[PDB]
């Protein structure tokens, strides 16, 4: 999983994507 586009696309709605162990966790508001 990407650790830049995942969180970047999550930034769109003030969301954050935690990329860890190849696992991106997008968290929207």
From Swiss-Prot:
Domain of life: Eukaryota
Major localization listed first in the record, in broad terms: secreted
Coiled-coil parts of chain: none
Cystines in this chain: 3-19, 6-24, 10-26
Localisation: Secreted
Pfam families named in the record: Toxin_6
SUPFAM superfamilies per UniProt: Scorpion toxin-like
GO cellular component: extracellular region
GO molecular function: ion channel inhibitor activity; potassium channel regulator activity; toxin activity
Tissue expression: Expressed by the venom gland.
Keywords, comma-separated and alphabetical: Calcium-activated potassium channel impairing toxin, Disulfide bond, Ion channel impairing toxin, Neurotoxin, Potassium channel impairing toxin, Secreted, Toxin
Purpose of the protein: Blocker for the small conductance calcium-activated potassium channels (KCa2).
Record remark: domains: Has the structural arrangement of an alpha-helix connected to a beta-sheet by disulfide bonds (CSalpha/beta).
Additional comment: Negative results: does not or very weakly inhibits KCa2.2/KCNN2 (Kd >1 uM) and KCa2.3/KCNN3 (Kd >1 uM).
Family of this protein: Belongs to the short scorpion toxin superfamily. Potassium channel inhibitor family. Alpha-KTx 08 subfamily.
Name listed for the protein in its UniProt record: Potassium channel toxin alpha-KTx 8.1
Source organism of the structure: Androctonus mauritanicus mauritanicus
């Amino acid at each position: 999983v990407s650790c830049e586009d995942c969180p970047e696309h999550c930034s769109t709605q003030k969301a954050q994507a935690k990329c860890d162990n190849d696992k991106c966790v997008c968290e929207p508001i």
